[PDB]
Design a protein around this nucleic acid. Structure first.
Length: 203
RNA sequence: CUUUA
């Protein structure tokens, strides 16, 4: 017999949790996932106004240890790519909330000597599907616009987590204005085609 | 009851 441990248990300190139910908010989920150790939750619209409750019904957890996401993903339901947990929320008898952690392989990529970057040479990309792979994201922008230098999924250095969507940066101001030249960029690479919404990058 | 700058 053989095993693949210590090579399939790596994970990020961030995990998406889908289907967050109505009514209840940050406190009830900080009590639902607590059975796997202490946790916290955040979203891009979060504020210190103590208003709570995300825009509709999805949120993202932050963790302190990389083994806590392992117990909450190994002691729950699965569906060939996502998982479910129970929370008995006030909208129904129960809300199967989903889980989907971030993986350590394509968080970022570069295709040049990592030249200096500026907010005047970077584009944001949103409306994306779940997979993207920063390697192929940069290669495609290089076949339709060129001048690419860096690509990856949007992240924050103070909370050490992704914010979904993505960004791309160029070593030329000409390739930058060519990438935000239309709301829908071309993602063709031969026998392949994708489309996504763009805007000037901002933070 | 299925994802955000």
């Amino acid at each position: 017999s053989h095993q693949n441990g210590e090579r399939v248990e790596r994970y990020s300190r961030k995990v998406f949790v889908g289907g967050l139910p109505p009514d209840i908010d940050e406190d009830e989920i900080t009590a639902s996932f607590r059975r796997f150790g202490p946790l916290i939750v955040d979203w891009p619209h979060k504020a210190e106004s103590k208003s709570y409750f995300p825009p509709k019904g999805y949120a993202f957890l932050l963790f302190q240890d990389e083994s806590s996401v392992q117990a909450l993903i190994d002691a729950c339901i699965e569906e060939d790519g996502k998982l479910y947990l129970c929370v008995s929320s006030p909208t129904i008898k129960d809300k199967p909330v989903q889980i989907r952690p971030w993986n350590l392989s394509d968080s970022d990529f570069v295709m040049d000597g990592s030249q200096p970057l500026d907010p005047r040479k970077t584009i944001f990309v949103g409306g994306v599907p779940r997979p993207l792979r920063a390697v192929e994201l940069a290669m495609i922008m290089d076949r339709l616009y060129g001048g690419v230098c860096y690509a990856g999924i949007d992240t924050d250095p103070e909370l050490k987590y992704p914010k979904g969507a993505g960004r791309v940066a160029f070593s030329n101001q000409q390739s930058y204005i060519a990438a935000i030249s239309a709301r829908f960029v071309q993602l063709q690479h031969g026998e392949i085609d994708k489309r996504v919404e763009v805007k000037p990058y901002v933070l």
